[PDB]
Design an enzyme around this catalytic site. Sequence first.
Site, PDB file in Angstrom:
ATOM      1  N   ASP A 103      -1.420  -7.894   0.051  1.00 63.40           N
ATOM      2  CA  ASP A 103      -0.575  -6.734   0.341  1.00 63.40           C
ATOM      3  C   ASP A 103       0.846  -7.208   0.654  1.00 63.40           C
ATOM      4  OD1 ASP A 103       0.606  -4.338   1.310  1.00 63.40           O
ATOM      5  OD2 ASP A 103      -1.370  -3.587   1.891  1.00 63.40           O
ATOM      6  N   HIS A 140       0.813  -1.211   0.000  1.00 62.38           N
ATOM      7  CA  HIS A 140       0.000   0.000   0.000  1.00 62.38           C
ATOM      8  C   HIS A 140       0.848   1.264   0.000  1.00 62.38           C
ATOM      9  CE1 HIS A 140       0.777  -0.387   4.368  1.00 62.38           C
ATOM     10  NE2 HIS A 140       0.648   0.927   4.376  1.00 62.38           N
ATOM     11  N   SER A 171       3.397  -0.023   9.279  1.00 59.23           N
ATOM     12  CA  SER A 171       3.198  -0.815   8.077  1.00 59.23           C
ATOM     13  C   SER A 171       4.259  -1.906   7.979  1.00 59.23           C
ATOM     14  CB  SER A 171       3.242   0.075   6.835  1.00 59.23           C
ATOM     15  OG  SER A 171       2.231   1.066   6.881  1.00 59.23           O
ATOM     16  N   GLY A 172       3.889  -3.014   7.343  1.00 63.10           N
ATOM     17  CA  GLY A 172       4.771  -4.160   7.266  1.00 63.10           C
ATOM     18  C   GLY A 172       4.910  -4.853   8.605  1.00 63.10           C
TER      19      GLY A 172
END
Lengths: 286, 237
Positions: free
Chosen positions: B90, B41, B186-187
Amino acid sequence: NLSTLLRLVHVDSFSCNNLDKSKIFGSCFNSITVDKFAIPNRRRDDLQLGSSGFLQSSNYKIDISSSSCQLYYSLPLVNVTINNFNPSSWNRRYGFGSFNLSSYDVVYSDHCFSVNSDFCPCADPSVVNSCAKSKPPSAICPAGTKYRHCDLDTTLYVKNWCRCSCLPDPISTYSPNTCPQKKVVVGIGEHCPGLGINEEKCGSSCFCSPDAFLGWSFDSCISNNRCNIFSNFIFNGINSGTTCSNDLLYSNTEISTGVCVNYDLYGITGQGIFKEVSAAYYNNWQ
Amino acid sequence: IVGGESALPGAWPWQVSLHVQNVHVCGGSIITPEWIVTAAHCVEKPLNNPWHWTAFAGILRQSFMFYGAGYQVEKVISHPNYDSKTKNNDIALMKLQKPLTFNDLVKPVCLPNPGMMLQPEQLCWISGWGATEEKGKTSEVLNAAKVLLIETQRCNSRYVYDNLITPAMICAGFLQGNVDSCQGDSGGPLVTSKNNIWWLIGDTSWGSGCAKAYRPGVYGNVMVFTDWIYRQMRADG
């Protein structure tokens, strides 16, 4: 007198913990607390000395560190009724009716809940207007109690998604901390504050549905055409007080004529042959 | 990370942060010293030109340089079947031009093998550089938290997400709240302990706030696309 009490009642079982039945004959106490209630035909094993069941947590708790007697007796089914009443004030405040169950059936709770004074199973209708998914019913809550806590949150694409507390039910909820209804355990001689109320069926004034109340069950108490009742006697004070018993040797002995015996007639001693004679010169105080 | 503590300088050499324009954006994990796994994303169309990207590894406090002492990203490959509406698949990979020789506090994590038969209520650890309580700034120090794994069937409840979790997704954390990752994490490496070794079985993609009731953490399932990553290895040489 324990003899007349055990004779006039259909005694089935009797056992006193931390107190022996031998010393009861001719002892004195300060006060006697008596509790009684019918025995459901499903939880006969809960009435034992020490059990973490539903009765000891929602219905009534029995103390173990004190001298107390437990009695189990039976009563005929003729001319008998059971008074099923909920002593919860906050449950009946929002329009709680009656149990509406058949006769000869006792009601027992499985989980006891408690709330604070600031509690209202009712949401603010001015906030619920901007809700599309899982929209709970709302109404005007009386003053002094805050409305139901609900927040509108977006997950990926849903703008009007309002989530509230106490979901799905207070019995099995995913976040008990966010729900004000807290599971509590009754203490020694303490009633339960009330049962659980489903906030999804509540909400004119806030009137919860009668079927939204959970945490109860009903069971018959008929056994051999008789109803079983358990009673608990707690004798506060020992070898003192003004509450004694006449279970001593003075148990209304029978009179006898012919031989002179000892006298203890109203604080008088002596001996002498008795003779029956018709006399009518006595009075009430004489 | 909410409710966690500061991560001591132990042995957690599977957290690489990707910086663009000299500001921290997201992190990532490494499996081999030739690739970096991260979320897709953050690789949208406005985030093109992978030449203006650097990678930081083995750095707890994010202050050791300024526009230097980094590793430039050569090429970024995203999942072809990626949808921005439902946020499915994702997974993104980045390639570095540096050999990345193994040294102290430098050890990647092996990919999870198929047929692991993990427990439903499995305990895992999360880490990243995100907010502290709610809508906060980037944490200067590295913090970690401990979470539990919840089944997908219970996560698909109408009061939690109402069937919005794809089979290639998973849910973890605590339903009571107070333990969740905020915006910026994120991640992130979602590793679990098994056979006395760590297995990376998670990838954070999105989430509905942090430290909120009925809003657990959502992670990506890389076990289905693991072989797909192997396909990318066929594009290596």
